[PDB]
Paper text:
If the HK incorporates a REC domain (REC-1) is denoted as hybrid histidine kinase (hHK), and the first His-Asp phosphotransfer event occurs in the same polypeptide chain. Then, HPt protein containing a phosphorylatable His shuffles the phosphoryl group from the phosphorylatable Asp in the REC-1 domain to the phosphorylatable Asp in the REC domain of an RR (REC-2) in two more phosphotransfer steps. In fungi, the HPt accepts the phosphoryl group from REC-1 domains of various hHKs upstream of the signaling pathway and forwards it downstream to REC-2 domains present in at least two conserved RRs, Ssk1 and Skn7. Also, we have obtained the crystal structures of Ct_HPt alone and in complex with REChHK6 bound to the phosphomimetic BeF3−, as well as the crystal structures of REChHK3 and RECCa_Sln1.
To analyze differences in the structure of Ct_HPt before and after binding to REChHK6, we obtained the crystal structure of isolated Ct_HPt. It contained four molecules in the AU and each molecule contributed to an interface area of ~800 Å2 between two molecules. The interface area contained several salt bridges between two Arg residues located in αE (R158 and R169) and two Glu residues located in αB (E82 and E89). Interestingly, R158 formed intrachain salt bridges with E82 and E89, as well as an interchain salt bridge with E82, while R169 formed an interchain salt bridge with E89. According to the EPPIC and PISA servers this interface was the result of crystal packing and SEC-MALS analysis with Ct_HPt indicated a MW of 18.1 kDa (theoretical MW is 18.7 kDa) demonstrating the presence of the monomeric species in solution. Finally, the structural comparison between Ct_HPt isolated and bound to REChHK6 demonstrated high structural similarity between them (rmsd of ~0.9 Å for 129 residues), although slight structural changes were observed in the N-terminal region, αA, loop αA–αB and loop αD–αE. Meanwhile, the intrachain salt bridge nucleated by R158 in αE with E82 and E89 in αB is also present and has not been disturbed. This fact indicates that Ct_HPt shows little plasticity, a useful conserved feature to be recognized similarly by several REC-1 domains. Finally, our studies have uncovered two salt bridges in Ct_HPt between two Glu residues in αB and an Arg residue in αE that provide bundle stability. As these residues seem rather conserved between human fungal pathogens, except in S. cerevisiae, we envision that these salt bridges could be present in other HPt proteins. These salt bridges do not intervene in complex recognition but seem to provide bundle stability preventing conformational plasticity.
Residue numbers in the entry: 43 to 63, 65 to 174
């Protein structure tokens, strides 16, 4: 009975859980790798924000969307989707956004969300894998 609320897609992550032979031999190493990797990615997003590098932010966004999607971590993936789009000058209505200043700001907002939601999910997983 694991409730991750809006953070986890039960179908996608559930499939992962069913691959365990009840010590989480497969799922937990994978969750750990996701989080270690996630934080390396955020550091780079931080650096890219400092240097105001929209193209790099987009790539970083695209990458973390893909790894989070594979685990069914949908709240993180949606934040990463935002970073991908705004990096390419596309708003959430899908319109062009020429003003780089606004894109940067939006990405910052989205990155703060992704980071916070990653923390919250990491806590819930630690609890799950310690039972």
């Amino acid at each position: 009975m694991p409730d991750f609320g809006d953070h986890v897609d039960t179908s996608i992550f559930g499939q992962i859980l069913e691959m365990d032979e009840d010590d989480h031999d497969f799922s937990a190493p994978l969750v750990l790798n996701f989080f270690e990797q996630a934080e390396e990615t955020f550091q780079k997003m931080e650096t890219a924000l400092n240097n105001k590098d929209l193209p790099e932010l987009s790539k970083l966004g695209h990458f973390l969307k893909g790894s989070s999607a594979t685990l069914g971590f949908t709240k993180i993936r949606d934040s990463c989707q935002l970073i991908q789009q705004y990096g390419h000058g596309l708003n959430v209505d899908g319109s062009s956004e020429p003003d780089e200043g606004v894109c940067l700001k939006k990405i910052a907002e989205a990155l703060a969300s992704a980071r916070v939601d990653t923390v919250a999910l990491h806590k819930m997983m630690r609890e799950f894998f310690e039972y």
